[PDB]
Design a protein around this nucleic acid. Structure first.
Ligand SMILES: [Cl-]
Ligand SMILES: [Cl-]
Ligand SMILES: [Cl-]
Ligand SMILES: [Cl-]
Ligand SMILES: [Cl-]
Ligand SMILES: [Cl-]
Ligand SMILES: [Cl-]
Ligand SMILES: [Mg+2]
Ligand SMILES: [Mg+2]
Ligand SMILES: [Mg+2]
Ligand SMILES: [Mg+2]
Ligand SMILES: [Mg+2]
Ligand SMILES: [Mg+2]
Ligand SMILES: [Mg+2]
Ligand SMILES: [Mg+2]
Ligand SMILES: [Mg+2]
Ligand SMILES: [Mg+2]
Ligand SMILES: [Mg+2]
Ligand SMILES: [Mg+2]
Ligand SMILES: [Mg+2]
Ligand SMILES: [Mg+2]
Ligand code: NA
Ligand code: NA
Ligand code: NA
Ligand code: NA
Ligand code: NA
Ligand code: NA
Ligand code: NA
Ligand code: NA
Ligand code: NA
Ligand code: NA
Ligand code: NA
Ligand code: NA
Ligand code: NA
Ligand code: NA
Ligand code: NA
Ligand SMILES: [Sr+2]
Ligand SMILES: [Sr+2]
Ligand SMILES: [Sr+2]
Ligand SMILES: [Sr+2]
Ligand SMILES: [Sr+2]
Ligand SMILES: [Sr+2]
Ligand SMILES: [Sr+2]
Ligand SMILES: [Sr+2]
Ligand SMILES: [Sr+2]
Ligand SMILES: [Sr+2]
Ligand SMILES: [Sr+2]
Ligand SMILES: [Sr+2]
Ligand SMILES: [Sr+2]
Ligand SMILES: [Sr+2]
Lengths: 142, 150, 142, 49
RNA sequence: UGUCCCAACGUUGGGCCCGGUGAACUGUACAUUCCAGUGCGGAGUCUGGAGACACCCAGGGGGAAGCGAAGACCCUAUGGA
RNA sequence: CGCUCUAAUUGGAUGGAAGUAGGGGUGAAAACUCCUAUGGACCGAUUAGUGACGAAAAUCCUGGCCAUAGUAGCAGCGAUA
RNA sequence: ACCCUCAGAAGGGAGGCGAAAUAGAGCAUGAAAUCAGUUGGCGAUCGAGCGACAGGGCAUACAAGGUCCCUCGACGAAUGACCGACGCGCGAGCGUCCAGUAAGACUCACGGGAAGCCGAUGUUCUGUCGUACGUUUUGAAAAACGAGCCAGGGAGUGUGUCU
């Protein structure tokens, strides 16, 4: 009568104190948008980042207000970089065999969009029985 | 051409459309805007009065150079686009006709939705001085109308 | 016509600029202020030079316009306006919660703000807003 | 010779137009022109062994 | 002898309003400006003030160092004729 | 980092591929990825190659389109109809 | 096809076919520019590189993010008190002690709370900074040059020889 998601939807990974601290830092500090200079001024200029190269470029010259310039200094903490917000490390899965070797306590699985409903159903029941959470679960009426 | 841009309940609604009409698109927006919400009958009487020159159509957007009209309410500029008005009369005639054929009281139905869309231009050319020719086109207009029981 | 002022200031024998400076400060802090007896407010210096300056403001102008007040009423309020960011929301709000009056339309007597008083027994080189207005050609309605 | 089979010439300065070779009011030959030559295309002379 | 003093009235066609038809030039963006100043020394856009309720019609063209034409002058090129 | 096609190894797709639209997540970033709708047949990953491989700009090219504008013109000619 | 409408082999309406007519004739898909209608935010007293970063308003079906707020407590870097006591200075005020104490960003735990609620997205408001971009140039917001807008197109390639 209502929609329910398959699998261990509420599962949380177990992280060391230091990893939870750094994951919490990443989430608190965040980062600037880092969109290309003046993308908002011209429709033909997309948001995709490009190093401002104009000799007189205000952003290139680092003028406050013209947006931040990509620099290594903005990198996220190594210990948490790339983690899903939940804290899990993601593993891209295309079939049931891809579930092999995955630690459901430290990794969550993400089924490629290309995968069909039939193969997804098998992957989803096998992941749950392996204690692995599926990030993009199927919702069935139960 | 267009497709109705608004949902319509067949059990309490009647529809109609004009296709590729060669008339002012700008006049059509003005007219649609003015008759929306009116009853089919009121719209008709209104448009006949426009063609007769007794009731101006407010020109709120395409108004450059347009002289003011005392009978325009809450606005200044207006005109009497008789051609696009006659086209709307055909549309209403079709709408009300369909309406009645379905068992509704056509004239009494409210104009729930009415919008004009420019579907293209009939291209023309006009010779100019100095050996050159410039565009001389005709707008092509589609217009949708949905009538609804009170 | 009725102005619930939290403060009623008496400008009599008080240095216009010093009162103005304090009324602006209070107005920005949320206080509703009514300056009274503006025609008796005072400005130090040599009357001839002072008048030359206010007459210059009266003569300045053109099509765009430089409407400078002649009544002690407006002279004083303009003085206050120049101490407020009257073109910003907060600034206009403050300025609009300040009113100046010829004489005292209230029943209470205004208070004399510290540091704004001029000792007539120790000063001979000063002028009265009212005197300036008369010279400017205003119709002495006070 | 792809894109080079045209006597297209540029009008130079004077008509408020970019100096692009044109023929019958159509731009041609140059790489930035639609129907123009390929600037640095695959070449048969290249040793691919 | 209306060239002028010194301009007036009138005529015809436009102009203005209405139906129909229906282009072009031009357009980095923003743009209600004005006075000063500053700045590559000739600013609607920077600074300080002043002024500024929105929209529309007609007008004569002050400004946009207006639009149109990669200055024809001048010089430079181990250029052309 | 991304693009084309080749090869080896290895996967996805009518229980819905690519693309597109809106939206969620990751990466300093190039860009990667998922969800929903549309779509209705193809699509990847790794490794070694391949190169007519990346655009905001050139009075750049071609196509499409907006403001200009319901504006100018549809009067002027010794043939005013 | 049939029917209705219409001056009408037009068009429209209803209907029939097909998995799909949003496959109905330059008829697979259907971007942007852009147009009509409409939803959210702003809006007829107010100011212009259109934003970046902070923080407020209002708006939000699901899915793909799940956090966030307040009492208190723990930890507690640099920094760092009030009050009180004593002692100086013409005075504003300062010194010694209280004391490197109380406080102190982040993070965490207990208890309570939020689900338009936290993130995020749209728009708008406030604060701070801010006169595009690319090029030319000693110096460009420039009254120096380029572009109306968008999509697609658009520039280190081959042979030989040498290093
Ligand atoms: Cl790195
Ligand atoms: Cl049009
Ligand atoms: Cl004035
Ligand atoms: Cl201000
Ligand atoms: Cl004195
Ligand atoms: Cl921390
Ligand atoms: Cl190179
Ligand atoms: Mg853009
Ligand atoms: Mg007019
Ligand atoms: Mg000719
Ligand atoms: Mg070619
Ligand atoms: Mg030249
Ligand atoms: Mg010469
Ligand atoms: Mg010679
Ligand atoms: Mg492999
Ligand atoms: Mg391209
Ligand atoms: Mg005009
Ligand atoms: Mg005659
Ligand atoms: Mg198609
Ligand atoms: Mg470039
Ligand atoms: Mg120079
Ligand atoms: Na308008
Ligand atoms: Na009116
Ligand atoms: Na009226
Ligand atoms: Na003074
Ligand atoms: Na004045
Ligand atoms: Na040829
Ligand atoms: Na070869
Ligand atoms: Na005469
Ligand atoms: Na002018
Ligand atoms: Na051009
Ligand atoms: Na907001
Ligand atoms: Na240049
Ligand atoms: Na520049
Ligand atoms: Na300049
Ligand atoms: Na154009
Ligand atoms: Sr899919
Ligand atoms: Sr208009
Ligand atoms: Sr103060
Ligand atoms: Sr020339
Ligand atoms: Sr200013
Ligand atoms: Sr004129
Ligand atoms: Sr669309
Ligand atoms: Sr290329
Ligand atoms: Sr046009
Ligand atoms: Sr005639
Ligand atoms: Sr003529
Ligand atoms: Sr049908
Ligand atoms: Sr401590
Ligand atoms: Sr392009």
């Amino acid at each position: 009568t209502e929609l329910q998601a398959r699998g261990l939807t509420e599962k949380t990974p177990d992280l060391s104190d230091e990893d939870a601290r750094l994951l919490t830092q990443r989430h608190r500090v965040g980062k600037p948008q880092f969109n290309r200079q003046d993308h908002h001024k011209k429709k033909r200029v997309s948001t995709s980042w490009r190093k401002p190269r104009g000799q007189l470029s205000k952003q290139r010259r680092g003028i406050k207000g013209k947006g931040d310039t990509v620099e290594a200094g903005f990198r996220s903490p190594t210990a948490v970089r790339g983690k899903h917000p939940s804290g899990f490390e993601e593993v891209r899965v295309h079939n049931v065999d891809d579930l092999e070797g995955v630690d459901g306590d430290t990794e969550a699985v993400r089924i490629a969009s290309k995968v069909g409903a039939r193969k997804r159903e098998r992957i989803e029941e096998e992941a749950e029985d392996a204690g692995i959470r599926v990030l993009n679960p199927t919702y069935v009426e139960v | 051409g267009i497709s109705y841009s608004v949902e319509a309940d067949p059990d309490t609604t009647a529809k109609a459309m004009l296709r590729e009409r060669q008339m002012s698109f700008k006049h059509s927006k003005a007219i649609a805007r003015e008759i929306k919400g009116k009853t089919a009958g009121e719209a008709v009487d209104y448009l006949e009065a426009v063609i007769e020159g007794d009731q101006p159509v407010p020109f709120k957007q395409h108004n450059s150079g347009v002289g003011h009209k005392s009978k325009v309410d809450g606005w200044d500029a207006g005109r009497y686009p008789e051609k696009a008005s006659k086209a709307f009369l055909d549309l209403l005639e079709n709408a009300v006709g369909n309406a009645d054929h379905q068992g509704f009281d056509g004239e009494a139905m409210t104009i729930k939705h009415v919008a004009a869309h420019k579907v293209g231009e009939q291209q023309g050319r006009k010779p100019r001085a100095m050996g050159r020719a410039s565009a001389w086109n005709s707008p092509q207009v589609d217009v949708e109308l949905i009538l609804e029981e009170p | 016509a009725e102005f619930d002022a939290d403060v009623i200031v008496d400008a009599r024998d008080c240095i216009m600029g010093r009162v103005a400076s304090q009324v602006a400060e209070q107005a920005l802090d949320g206080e509703t202020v009514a300056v009274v007896n503006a025609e008796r407010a005072v400005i130090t210096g040599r009357e001839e030079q002072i008048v030359e300056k206010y007459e210059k403001r009266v003569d300045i102008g053109n099509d765009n316009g430089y409407f400078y007040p002649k009544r002690p009423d407006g002279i004083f309020k303009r003085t206050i306006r120049g101490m407020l960011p009257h073109k910003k929301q907060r600034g206009r709000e403050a300025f609009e919660s300040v009113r100046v009056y010829l004489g005292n339309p209230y029943d209470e007597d205004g208070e004399v703000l510290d540091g704004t008083s001029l000792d007539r027994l120790s000063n001979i080189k000063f002028v009265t807003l009212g005197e300036i207005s008369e010279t400017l050609g205003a119709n002495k309605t006070w | 010779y792809a894109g080079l089979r045209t006597p297209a010439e540029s009008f130079g300065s004077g008509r408020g137009q970019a100096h692009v070779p044109k023929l019958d009011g159509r731009a041609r030959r140059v790489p930035q022109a639609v129907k123009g030559r390929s600037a640095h295309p695959p070449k048969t002379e290249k040793d691919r062994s």
